[PDB]
mmCIF file of C-alpha atoms and ligand atoms in Angstrom:
data_model
loop_
_atom_site.group_PDB
_atom_site.id
_atom_site.type_symbol
_atom_site.label_atom_id
_atom_site.label_comp_id
_atom_site.label_asym_id
_atom_site.label_seq_id
_atom_site.Cartn_x
_atom_site.Cartn_y
_atom_site.Cartn_z
ATOM 1 C CA UNK A 22 -13.946 -27.154 -6.989
ATOM 2 C CA UNK A 23 -13.294 -26.748 -3.305
ATOM 3 C CA UNK A 24 -9.998 -28.759 -2.955
ATOM 4 C CA UNK A 25 -6.549 -27.323 -3.783
ATOM 5 C CA UNK A 26 -5.073 -29.235 -6.737
ATOM 6 C CA UNK A 27 -1.440 -29.153 -7.548
ATOM 7 C CA UNK A 28 -1.753 -26.313 -10.088
ATOM 8 C CA UNK A 29 -3.495 -24.057 -7.654
ATOM 9 C CA UNK A 30 -1.153 -24.826 -4.788
ATOM 10 C CA UNK A 31 1.758 -23.992 -7.211
ATOM 11 C CA UNK A 32 0.044 -20.688 -8.278
ATOM 12 C CA UNK A 33 -0.328 -19.650 -4.580
ATOM 13 C CA UNK A 34 3.374 -20.428 -3.926
ATOM 14 C CA UNK A 35 4.542 -18.539 -7.022
ATOM 15 C CA UNK A 36 2.509 -15.476 -6.035
ATOM 16 C CA UNK A 37 3.887 -15.629 -2.474
ATOM 17 C CA UNK A 38 7.445 -15.997 -3.634
ATOM 18 C CA UNK A 39 7.048 -13.118 -6.038
ATOM 19 C CA UNK A 40 5.670 -11.042 -3.124
ATOM 20 C CA UNK A 41 8.685 -11.909 -0.830
ATOM 21 C CA UNK A 42 11.140 -11.240 -3.771
ATOM 22 C CA UNK A 43 9.736 -7.801 -4.742
ATOM 23 C CA UNK A 44 8.646 -6.181 -1.492
ATOM 24 C CA UNK A 45 11.624 -5.595 0.899
ATOM 25 C CA UNK A 46 9.461 -5.020 3.865
ATOM 26 C CA UNK A 47 7.111 -8.015 4.518
ATOM 27 C CA UNK A 48 4.839 -8.463 7.477
ATOM 28 C CA UNK A 49 7.037 -10.979 9.302
ATOM 29 C CA UNK A 50 9.944 -8.546 9.369
ATOM 30 C CA UNK A 51 7.701 -5.518 10.210
ATOM 31 C CA UNK A 52 5.977 -7.247 13.133
ATOM 32 C CA UNK A 53 9.379 -8.327 14.611
ATOM 33 C CA UNK A 54 10.656 -4.680 14.443
ATOM 34 C CA UNK A 55 7.357 -3.460 15.916
ATOM 35 C CA UNK A 56 7.430 -6.078 18.683
ATOM 36 C CA UNK A 57 11.066 -5.507 19.693
ATOM 37 C CA UNK A 58 11.886 -9.132 20.581
ATOM 38 C CA UNK A 59 14.688 -9.720 18.100
ATOM 39 C CA UNK A 60 16.617 -6.540 19.053
ATOM 40 C CA UNK A 61 16.873 -3.915 21.752
ATOM 41 C CA UNK A 62 17.839 -1.277 19.203
ATOM 42 C CA UNK A 63 14.437 0.082 18.174
ATOM 43 C CA UNK A 64 13.706 2.426 15.216
ATOM 44 C CA UNK A 65 14.258 6.175 15.703
ATOM 45 C CA UNK A 66 10.944 7.582 16.717
ATOM 46 C CA UNK A 67 9.661 10.761 14.983
ATOM 47 C CA UNK A 68 7.046 12.109 17.321
ATOM 48 C CA UNK A 69 7.461 15.873 17.079
ATOM 49 C CA UNK A 70 9.152 18.646 14.936
ATOM 50 C CA UNK A 71 12.491 18.239 16.851
ATOM 51 C CA UNK A 72 12.848 14.555 16.189
ATOM 52 C CA UNK A 73 11.713 15.134 12.592
ATOM 53 C CA UNK A 74 14.526 17.617 11.942
ATOM 54 C CA UNK A 75 16.841 15.197 13.737
ATOM 55 C CA UNK A 76 15.928 12.360 11.370
ATOM 56 C CA UNK A 77 16.240 14.808 8.479
ATOM 57 C CA UNK A 78 19.895 15.456 9.259
ATOM 58 C CA UNK A 79 20.416 11.823 8.082
ATOM 59 C CA UNK A 80 18.377 12.621 4.889
ATOM 60 C CA UNK A 81 20.087 15.896 3.995
ATOM 61 C CA UNK A 82 21.746 14.706 0.776
ATOM 62 C CA UNK A 83 18.358 13.440 -0.559
ATOM 63 C CA UNK A 84 16.473 16.506 0.532
ATOM 64 C CA UNK A 85 19.021 18.764 -0.976
ATOM 65 C CA UNK A 86 19.279 16.853 -4.191
ATOM 66 C CA UNK A 87 15.446 17.078 -4.512
ATOM 67 C CA UNK A 88 15.221 20.801 -3.521
ATOM 68 C CA UNK A 89 13.210 19.972 -0.380
ATOM 69 C CA UNK A 90 15.311 20.860 2.512
ATOM 70 C CA UNK A 91 13.839 24.366 2.957
ATOM 71 C CA UNK A 92 10.269 23.427 2.219
ATOM 72 C CA UNK A 93 7.626 23.376 5.026
ATOM 73 C CA UNK A 94 7.786 20.445 7.396
ATOM 74 C CA UNK A 95 4.574 18.998 6.192
ATOM 75 C CA UNK A 96 5.774 19.183 2.563
ATOM 76 C CA UNK A 97 9.043 17.554 3.466
ATOM 77 C CA UNK A 98 7.354 14.613 5.236
ATOM 78 C CA UNK A 99 5.101 13.857 2.307
ATOM 79 C CA UNK A 100 7.741 14.300 -0.313
ATOM 80 C CA UNK A 101 9.568 11.394 1.393
ATOM 81 C CA UNK A 102 6.340 9.483 1.634
ATOM 82 C CA UNK A 103 5.673 9.982 -2.044
ATOM 83 C CA UNK A 104 9.239 8.650 -2.896
ATOM 84 C CA UNK A 105 8.213 5.528 -0.883
ATOM 85 C CA UNK A 106 4.934 5.143 -2.768
ATOM 86 C CA UNK A 107 6.978 5.475 -6.070
ATOM 87 C CA UNK A 108 9.233 2.596 -4.996
ATOM 88 C CA UNK A 109 6.143 0.459 -4.065
ATOM 89 C CA UNK A 110 4.550 1.167 -7.450
ATOM 90 C CA UNK A 111 7.811 -0.040 -9.125
ATOM 91 C CA UNK A 112 7.748 -3.185 -6.955
ATOM 92 C CA UNK A 113 4.064 -3.821 -7.683
ATOM 93 C CA UNK A 114 4.701 -3.448 -11.356
ATOM 94 C CA UNK A 115 7.321 -6.203 -11.225
ATOM 95 C CA UNK A 116 5.141 -8.288 -8.845
ATOM 96 C CA UNK A 117 2.203 -8.167 -11.335
ATOM 97 C CA UNK A 118 4.385 -10.074 -13.932
ATOM 98 C CA UNK A 119 4.060 -13.206 -11.720
ATOM 99 C CA UNK A 120 0.179 -13.150 -11.917
ATOM 100 C CA UNK A 121 -0.599 -15.755 -14.642
ATOM 101 C CA UNK A 122 -2.149 -14.010 -17.600
ATOM 102 C CA UNK A 123 -1.117 -10.407 -16.686
ATOM 103 C CA UNK A 124 1.818 -10.043 -18.975
ATOM 104 C CA UNK A 125 -0.319 -11.506 -21.815
ATOM 105 C CA UNK A 126 -2.805 -8.606 -21.560
ATOM 106 C CA UNK A 127 -2.851 -5.680 -23.866
ATOM 107 C CA UNK A 128 -0.331 -3.195 -22.643
ATOM 108 C CA UNK A 129 -3.016 -0.536 -22.137
ATOM 109 C CA UNK A 130 -4.939 -2.910 -19.932
ATOM 110 C CA UNK A 131 -1.882 -3.699 -17.854
ATOM 111 C CA UNK A 132 -1.402 0.126 -17.399
ATOM 112 C CA UNK A 133 -4.998 0.560 -16.449
ATOM 113 C CA UNK A 134 -4.922 -2.285 -13.913
ATOM 114 C CA UNK A 135 -1.840 -0.893 -12.256
ATOM 115 C CA UNK A 136 -3.156 2.718 -12.440
ATOM 116 C CA UNK A 137 -6.225 1.898 -10.317
ATOM 117 C CA UNK A 138 -4.771 -0.981 -8.336
ATOM 118 C CA UNK A 139 -1.460 0.093 -6.920
ATOM 119 C CA UNK A 140 -2.811 2.401 -4.171
ATOM 120 C CA UNK A 141 -5.394 -0.222 -3.012
ATOM 121 C CA UNK A 142 -2.403 -2.647 -2.730
ATOM 122 C CA UNK A 143 -0.210 0.118 -1.152
ATOM 123 C CA UNK A 144 -2.707 0.894 1.564
ATOM 124 C CA UNK A 145 -3.415 -2.834 2.204
ATOM 125 C CA UNK A 146 0.379 -3.561 2.569
ATOM 126 C CA UNK A 147 0.954 -0.387 4.509
ATOM 127 C CA UNK A 148 -1.221 -2.016 7.304
ATOM 128 C CA UNK A 149 1.767 -4.457 7.840
ATOM 129 C CA UNK A 150 4.054 -1.707 9.062
ATOM 130 C CA UNK A 151 1.361 0.143 11.186
ATOM 131 C CA UNK A 152 0.246 -0.450 14.753
ATOM 132 C CA UNK A 153 -2.169 1.790 16.818
ATOM 133 C CA UNK A 154 0.646 4.190 17.590
ATOM 134 C CA UNK A 155 2.431 4.861 14.279
ATOM 135 C CA UNK A 156 4.018 3.427 11.215
ATOM 136 C CA UNK A 157 7.497 2.250 10.209
ATOM 137 C CA UNK A 158 9.429 4.376 7.685
ATOM 138 C CA UNK A 159 12.797 4.241 6.047
ATOM 139 C CA UNK A 160 12.924 0.452 5.536
ATOM 140 C CA UNK A 161 11.902 -0.192 9.171
ATOM 141 C CA UNK A 162 14.572 2.120 10.612
ATOM 142 C CA UNK A 163 12.209 4.976 11.576
ATOM 143 C CA UNK A 164 8.820 5.118 13.308
ATOM 144 C CA UNK A 165 6.519 8.111 12.850
ATOM 145 C CA UNK A 166 3.919 8.468 15.491
ATOM 146 C CA UNK A 167 0.279 8.488 14.644
ATOM 147 C CA UNK A 168 -0.273 11.562 16.895
ATOM 148 C CA UNK A 169 2.524 13.495 15.304
ATOM 149 C CA UNK A 170 0.784 13.037 11.914
ATOM 150 C CA UNK A 171 -2.536 14.270 13.344
ATOM 151 C CA UNK A 172 -0.661 17.226 14.766
ATOM 152 C CA UNK A 173 0.431 18.518 11.364
ATOM 153 C CA UNK A 174 -1.383 21.504 10.018
ATOM 154 C CA UNK A 175 -4.452 21.054 7.814
ATOM 155 C CA UNK A 176 -4.952 19.544 5.446
ATOM 156 C CA UNK A 177 -1.805 17.381 5.840
ATOM 157 C CA UNK A 178 -3.050 15.943 9.094
ATOM 158 C CA UNK A 179 -6.010 14.439 7.339
ATOM 159 C CA UNK A 180 -3.965 12.228 4.947
ATOM 160 C CA UNK A 181 -2.714 9.285 6.978
ATOM 161 C CA UNK A 182 -5.280 8.894 9.675
ATOM 162 C CA UNK A 183 -7.800 7.193 7.461
ATOM 163 C CA UNK A 184 -5.136 4.712 6.494
ATOM 164 C CA UNK A 185 -4.394 4.016 10.118
ATOM 165 C CA UNK A 186 -8.192 3.458 10.679
ATOM 166 C CA UNK A 187 -8.332 0.939 7.808
ATOM 167 C CA UNK A 188 -5.114 -0.799 8.900
ATOM 168 C CA UNK A 189 -6.286 -1.387 12.611
ATOM 169 C CA UNK A 190 -9.339 -3.328 11.342
ATOM 170 C CA UNK A 191 -7.412 -5.087 8.531
ATOM 171 C CA UNK A 192 -4.573 -6.170 10.993
ATOM 172 C CA UNK A 193 -7.388 -7.612 13.264
ATOM 173 C CA UNK A 194 -7.872 -10.320 10.475
ATOM 174 C CA UNK A 195 -4.406 -11.695 11.377
ATOM 175 C CA UNK A 196 -3.283 -12.254 7.717
ATOM 176 C CA UNK A 197 0.113 -13.524 7.000
ATOM 177 C CA UNK A 198 2.289 -12.819 3.959
ATOM 178 C CA UNK A 199 0.958 -15.825 2.030
ATOM 179 C CA UNK A 200 -2.603 -14.429 2.389
ATOM 180 C CA UNK A 201 -1.531 -10.733 1.645
ATOM 181 C CA UNK A 202 0.276 -11.849 -1.566
ATOM 182 C CA UNK A 203 -2.779 -13.349 -3.027
ATOM 183 C CA UNK A 204 -4.947 -10.435 -1.743
ATOM 184 C CA UNK A 205 -2.738 -8.034 -3.527
ATOM 185 C CA UNK A 206 -2.860 -10.050 -6.749
ATOM 186 C CA UNK A 207 -6.632 -10.072 -6.451
ATOM 187 C CA UNK A 208 -6.666 -6.323 -6.161
ATOM 188 C CA UNK A 209 -4.490 -5.896 -9.279
ATOM 189 C CA UNK A 210 -6.805 -8.194 -11.262
ATOM 190 C CA UNK A 211 -10.039 -6.265 -10.708
ATOM 191 C CA UNK A 212 -11.935 -6.392 -14.006
ATOM 192 C CA UNK A 213 -14.176 -3.417 -12.964
ATOM 193 C CA UNK A 214 -11.496 -0.721 -13.637
ATOM 194 C CA UNK A 215 -12.552 2.216 -15.924
ATOM 195 C CA UNK A 216 -11.431 1.870 -19.507
ATOM 196 C CA UNK A 217 -10.409 -1.765 -19.541
ATOM 197 C CA UNK A 218 -10.529 -3.100 -23.100
ATOM 198 C CA UNK A 219 -10.546 -6.896 -22.674
ATOM 199 C CA UNK A 220 -12.881 -7.223 -19.667
ATOM 200 C CA UNK A 221 -13.868 -10.783 -20.328
ATOM 201 C CA UNK A 222 -10.194 -11.974 -20.347
ATOM 202 C CA UNK A 223 -9.348 -9.943 -17.250
ATOM 203 C CA UNK A 224 -12.397 -11.353 -15.447
ATOM 204 C CA UNK A 225 -11.127 -14.841 -16.114
ATOM 205 C CA UNK A 226 -7.682 -13.991 -14.882
ATOM 206 C CA UNK A 227 -9.317 -12.500 -11.653
ATOM 207 C CA UNK A 228 -11.550 -15.476 -11.133
ATOM 208 C CA UNK A 229 -8.542 -17.762 -11.087
ATOM 209 C CA UNK A 230 -6.750 -15.722 -8.460
ATOM 210 C CA UNK A 231 -9.799 -15.125 -6.277
ATOM 211 C CA UNK A 232 -10.463 -18.928 -6.450
ATOM 212 C CA UNK A 233 -6.987 -19.637 -5.079
ATOM 213 C CA UNK A 234 -7.364 -16.830 -2.510
ATOM 214 C CA UNK A 235 -10.662 -18.408 -1.148
ATOM 215 C CA UNK A 236 -9.247 -21.927 -0.921
ATOM 216 C CA UNK A 237 -5.999 -20.772 0.598
ATOM 217 C CA UNK A 238 -7.820 -18.720 3.214
ATOM 218 C CA UNK A 239 -10.061 -21.663 4.030
ATOM 219 C CA UNK A 240 -6.967 -23.884 4.529
ATOM 220 C CA UNK A 241 -4.740 -21.248 6.174
ATOM 221 C CA UNK A 242 -7.429 -19.876 8.507
ATOM 222 C CA UNK A 243 -9.952 -22.664 8.912
ATOM 223 C CA UNK A 244 -11.419 -21.189 12.122
ATOM 224 C CA UNK A 245 -12.255 -17.824 10.549
ATOM 225 C CA UNK A 246 -14.921 -19.242 8.344
ATOM 226 C CA UNK A 247 -15.971 -16.078 6.555
ATOM 227 C CA UNK A 248 -12.506 -14.610 6.168
ATOM 228 C CA UNK A 249 -12.890 -14.638 2.436
ATOM 229 C CA UNK A 250 -16.105 -12.633 2.346
ATOM 230 C CA UNK A 251 -14.618 -10.349 5.020
ATOM 231 C CA UNK A 252 -11.658 -9.605 2.547
ATOM 232 C CA UNK A 253 -14.095 -9.055 -0.437
ATOM 233 C CA UNK A 254 -15.565 -6.271 1.802
ATOM 234 C CA UNK A 255 -11.947 -5.078 2.557
ATOM 235 C CA UNK A 256 -11.363 -4.754 -1.120
ATOM 236 C CA UNK A 257 -14.407 -2.459 -1.499
ATOM 237 C CA UNK A 258 -13.240 -0.517 1.447
ATOM 238 C CA UNK A 259 -9.871 -0.014 -0.142
ATOM 239 C CA UNK A 260 -11.489 1.239 -3.377
ATOM 240 C CA UNK A 261 -13.455 3.841 -1.326
ATOM 241 C CA UNK A 262 -10.305 4.722 0.698
ATOM 242 C CA UNK A 263 -8.328 5.288 -2.505
ATOM 243 C CA UNK A 264 -11.097 7.293 -4.167
ATOM 244 C CA UNK A 265 -11.097 9.642 -1.206
ATOM 245 C CA UNK A 266 -7.314 9.778 -1.019
ATOM 246 C CA UNK A 267 -7.018 10.740 -4.674
ATOM 247 C CA UNK A 268 -9.686 13.383 -4.224
ATOM 248 C CA UNK A 269 -7.885 14.887 -1.219
ATOM 249 C CA UNK A 270 -4.599 14.877 -3.186
ATOM 250 C CA UNK A 271 -6.245 17.020 -5.824
ATOM 251 C CA UNK A 272 -7.556 19.410 -3.317
ATOM 252 C CA UNK A 273 -4.137 19.737 -1.546
ATOM 253 C CA UNK A 274 -2.302 19.850 -4.908
ATOM 254 C CA UNK A 275 -4.480 22.874 -5.955
ATOM 255 C CA UNK A 276 -4.421 24.816 -2.720
ATOM 256 C CA UNK A 277 -0.731 24.223 -1.703
ATOM 257 C CA UNK A 278 1.522 26.069 -4.292
ATOM 258 C CA UNK A 279 4.773 24.885 -2.624
ATOM 259 C CA UNK A 280 3.898 21.129 -2.570
ATOM 260 C CA UNK A 281 4.630 19.258 -5.746
ATOM 261 C CA UNK A 282 3.084 15.944 -6.778
ATOM 262 C CA UNK A 283 5.765 13.477 -7.926
ATOM 263 C CA UNK A 284 5.807 13.137 -11.721
ATOM 264 C CA UNK A 285 5.133 9.323 -11.712
ATOM 265 C CA UNK A 286 2.358 9.816 -9.138
ATOM 266 C CA UNK A 287 0.970 12.599 -11.394
ATOM 267 C CA UNK A 288 0.221 10.248 -14.207
ATOM 268 C CA UNK A 289 -1.382 7.654 -11.739
ATOM 269 C CA UNK A 290 -3.767 10.231 -10.269
ATOM 270 C CA UNK A 291 -4.489 11.865 -13.618
ATOM 271 C CA UNK A 292 -8.216 11.316 -14.404
ATOM 272 C CA UNK A 293 -8.341 8.512 -11.869
ATOM 273 C CA UNK A 294 -11.510 9.375 -9.994
HETATM 274 C C1 C5F B 301 15.779 6.752 3.691
HETATM 275 C C2 C5F B 301 14.823 7.204 2.522
HETATM 276 C C3 C5F B 301 15.129 8.597 2.048
HETATM 277 O O1 C5F B 301 13.455 6.815 2.876
HETATM 278 C C4 C5F B 301 12.629 7.623 3.701
HETATM 279 C C5 C5F B 301 13.112 8.856 4.467
HETATM 280 C C6 C5F B 301 12.145 9.706 5.421
HETATM 281 C C7 C5F B 301 10.710 9.228 5.554
HETATM 282 C C8 C5F B 301 9.837 10.147 6.457
HETATM 283 C C9 C5F B 301 10.010 11.575 6.835
HETATM 284 C C10 C5F B 301 10.072 10.499 7.889
HETATM 285 CL CL1 C5F B 301 11.668 9.958 8.472
HETATM 286 CL CL2 C5F B 301 8.603 10.478 8.918
HETATM 287 C C11 C5F B 301 10.202 8.016 4.776
HETATM 288 C C12 C5F B 301 11.189 7.162 3.821
HETATM 289 C C13 C5F B 301 15.119 6.297 1.292
HETATM 290 O O2 C5F B 301 14.288 5.848 0.617
HETATM 291 O O3 C5F B 301 16.423 6.111 0.995
HETATM 292 C C1 C5F B 302 0.415 8.263 0.523
HETATM 293 C C2 C5F B 302 0.787 9.377 -0.404
HETATM 294 C C3 C5F B 302 2.337 9.811 -0.073
HETATM 295 O O1 C5F B 302 -0.109 10.571 -0.140
HETATM 296 C C4 C5F B 302 0.223 11.828 -0.623
HETATM 297 C C5 C5F B 302 0.362 12.930 0.401
HETATM 298 C C6 C5F B 302 0.764 14.287 -0.088
HETATM 299 C C7 C5F B 302 1.146 14.567 -1.480
HETATM 300 C C8 C5F B 302 1.569 15.995 -1.953
HETATM 301 C C9 C5F B 302 1.393 17.349 -1.307
HETATM 302 C C10 C5F B 302 0.703 17.100 -2.636
HETATM 303 CL CL1 C5F B 302 -1.028 16.709 -2.613
HETATM 304 CL CL2 C5F B 302 1.453 17.834 -4.073
HETATM 305 C C11 C5F B 302 1.128 13.359 -2.537
HETATM 306 C C12 C5F B 302 0.635 12.067 -2.127
HETATM 307 C C13 C5F B 302 0.723 8.952 -1.763
HETATM 308 O O2 C5F B 302 -0.357 9.187 -2.514
HETATM 309 O O3 C5F B 302 1.683 8.342 -2.369
#
């Protein structure tokens, strides 16, 4: 129907609580850091090569242990960014268990849904820690400027800017964590992924989440009448954004002998698009 019964309201709260439990950086926390109203101690700003190398003095143990300290600056940056993606994949994998029906799926279908869904979710949630000038890193303790990322040498300067472009329009929708949690659940449940076995079952799982998403958006943002259709379009945009990101990763991986794709991320991108 069009009214939120108790089972739907409970489902929405369960997804929201799993989102808060599994993702350390939520939008409320990110925006207070980015706003600077709860503290006069801002994140360390990485805006050029000098401040990058300053920040990396704190990270020396991790860079040394990973054999990255002497790699080119661009490679060092996106090695750390890869490690962050790996953490978020792990968190999304645990989050998906809270989606009613997900754990009941064939294990191969769970793997397929997460394979194609995680980076759409990652770039959706990445918007929460982005403003027009840069993005929070290191659990909100650092802030790497958008211009410094564009200043990197090709093709590394082409990686993050499309994600900033998406985030600025996504953030204009003014979603809160309760919306984003259901949006991320809907992303994970897409029944259109390549190689899914039990499509019918997955589509019924997806329909339940998307129904709760619509009713929740209508209740939580009553003045933005078509916010739900707007978000359906954002899901399509994310699929295109990830398709292009994966293609660019393949190009870079093949023409950059000293940059290494993280093993876990290797399997994700393997035969993706
Ligand atoms: C603190 C650490 C290593 O996370 C990081 C560290 C560095 C970065 C990137 C390079 C800048 Cl600083 Cl732009 C992102 C996440 C961690 O996960 O423990
Ligand atoms: C957002 C992020 C970090 O993008 C990248 C960017 C660069 C790389 C590294 C250099 C090769 Cl291409 Cl080996 C892998 C992934 C990701 O996909 O997790």
